[PDB]
Paper text:
Persistent infection requires functional flagella that are heavily glycosylated with 5,7-diacetamido-3,5,7,9-tetradeoxy-L-glycero-L-manno-nonulosonic acid (pseudaminic acid). Pseudaminic acid biosynthesis protein H (PseH) catalyzes the third step in its biosynthetic pathway, producing UDP-2,4-diacetamido-2,4,6-trideoxy-β-L-altropyranose. It belongs to the GCN5-related N-acetyltransferase (GNAT) superfamily. Mutation in the pseH gene of the closely related species Campylobacter jejuni resulted in a non-motile phenotype that lacked flagella filaments and hook structures, indicating that PseH plays an essential role in flagella assembly.
The structure of recombinant H. pylori PseH (residues 1–180 plus an additional GIDPFT fragment (cloning artifact)) was determined to 2.3 Å resolution by using the multiple isomorphous replacement coupled with anomalous scattering (MIRAS) method with two mercury derivatives. The asymmetric unit contains three molecules. When subjected to gel filtration, the protein eluted as a single peak with an apparent molecular weight of approximately 36 kDa, indicating that PseH behaves as a dimer in solution. The PseH structure has a central twisted seven-stranded β-sheet flanked by five α-helices. Analysis of the difference Fourier map revealed an AcCoA binding site between the splayed strands β4 and β5, which is the common cofactor site of GNAT superfamily enzymes. The carbonyl group of the thioester forms a bifurcated hydrogen bond with the main-chain amide of Ile93 (strand β4) and the hydroxyl of Tyr138, the putative general acid catalyst in the reaction. Our structural analysis suggests that there are no residues in the vicinity of the AcCoA acetyl group that could serve as an acetyl acceptor and, thus, it is unlikely that the reaction proceeds through an enzyme-acetyl intermediate. Notably, the 6’-methyl group of the altrose points into a hydrophobic pocket formed by the side-chains of Met39, Tyr40, Met129 and the apolar portion of the β-mercaptoethylamine moiety of AcCoA, which dictates preference to the methyl over the hydroxyl group and thus to contributes to substrate specificity of PseH.
Author numbering:
A (entry chain A), B (entry chain A): 2 to 179
Write the structure that this text describes.
Amino acid sequence: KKNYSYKNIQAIDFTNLNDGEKLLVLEFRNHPNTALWMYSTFISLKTHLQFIEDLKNSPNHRYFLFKEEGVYLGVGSITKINFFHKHGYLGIYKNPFLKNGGETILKALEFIAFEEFQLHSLHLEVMENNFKAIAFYEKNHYELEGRLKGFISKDKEFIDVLLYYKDKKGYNDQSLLK
Amino acid sequence: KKNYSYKNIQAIDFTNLNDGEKLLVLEFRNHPNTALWMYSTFISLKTHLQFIEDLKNSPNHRYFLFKEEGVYLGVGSITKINFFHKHGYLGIYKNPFLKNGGETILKALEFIAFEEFQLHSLHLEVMENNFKAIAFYEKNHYELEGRLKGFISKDKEFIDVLLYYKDKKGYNDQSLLK
Ligand SMILES: CC(=O)SCCNC(=O)CCNC(=O)[C@H](O)C(C)(C)COP(=O)(O)OP(=O)(O)OC[C@H]1O[C@@H](n2cnc3c(N)ncnc32)[C@H](O)[C@@H]1OP(=O)(O)O
Ligand SMILES: CC(=O)SCCNC(=O)CCNC(=O)[C@H](O)C(C)(C)COP(=O)(O)OP(=O)(O)OC[C@H]1O[C@@H](n2cnc3c(N)ncnc32)[C@H](O)[C@@H]1OP(=O)(O)O
């Protein structure tokens, strides 16, 4: 339950958020630009505060608020971590008031996952209609590995979740080639 | 947190297990024939008892001990349930001292998932080297939808998890054709 540093980027564990930061995360999370692409649309403050409390005893779920030179970039998570099998799932939503930031969050987040946690593989669940996220991860060398068919209810139809992954060798190859 | 009935089969929620049944489940679970195919190999009694306690406040995770005319058939679960999106994951291990039983557990379990819970889809994670389980689900009309690549550590190598699913229409088609 500690923070991390990558370049001039800080990853603030959710369990170390000051009270302003707790509300900022909630604002980021409930914004239409974020919520539309989440499994649940709206998080009450009560739910949010409880979630953060529960994270204190949930070492397999790590949420970070990313900050860089005074700017809050957005949120990244590494979840359903398993340390024997060395896998985890990645999640990101950027500050909805900023034009970019996702790339920076991803780089720091992958540093944490592959170097600090020494994970072997990272997996992604992304809604099949989330074209901006799909393109984003494909550009970052994430590779398609399947679907969860009809996993999501959207506008009264069931649509798919897409599954992507990156392993440690892939991560290494990116870094060897600067 | 209630039990269910399907034909002459009882599904006993883990939160309603008598103390003998709690130890029987643990015996089923830690047996080499079960454990070899689980994400974790060995569950201590302490962990087990805590797990059952936590299930009392975990409506999205349902574990059942199946019994039929005095015979304990094994365990089935419907987990990571989401009631807006109407999905869940299925899991089974039979009484390792019996030659069959999986089929019976599956039928009752699918009844619970699709009729009682009214889920739209059920998903499976199965280790790629688990040939007996693979054949079993394929025979029961589960359909391949992808992989979690290198998800599992086995004998110091990383192997894959296979993803399968069945939806409500598939379930219906089976039942229409008796
Ligand atoms: C596995 C999962 O995490 S699934 C859930 C994914 N999360 C979400 O969908 C939440 C909503 N979306 C986001 O948080 C983000 O858009 C992410 C994390 C998906 C991607 O991060 P982004 O910063 O948006 O990366 P992206 O490549 O799409 O940025 C757009 C680029 O074009 C510009 N741009 C900004 N907005 C847009 C836009 N709507 N359309 C096209 N270009 C845009 C930007 O300037 C940026 O380029 P630059 O940094 O060089 O200046
Ligand atoms: C998504 C998930 O749940 S993944 C984890 C799956 N669970 C496990 O791997 C735990 C260990 N294995 C099991 O629990 C079970 O074997 C299951 C649930 C996978 C399948 O249930 P089973 O009862 O074994 O079904 P299966 O079709 O393989 O039964 C074997 C059949 O051939 C006979 N048979 C019994 N043992 C064997 C055996 N080792 N090999 C071949 N045939 C056998 C049986 O008589 C049975 O037929 P019958 O009921 O008509 O008499």
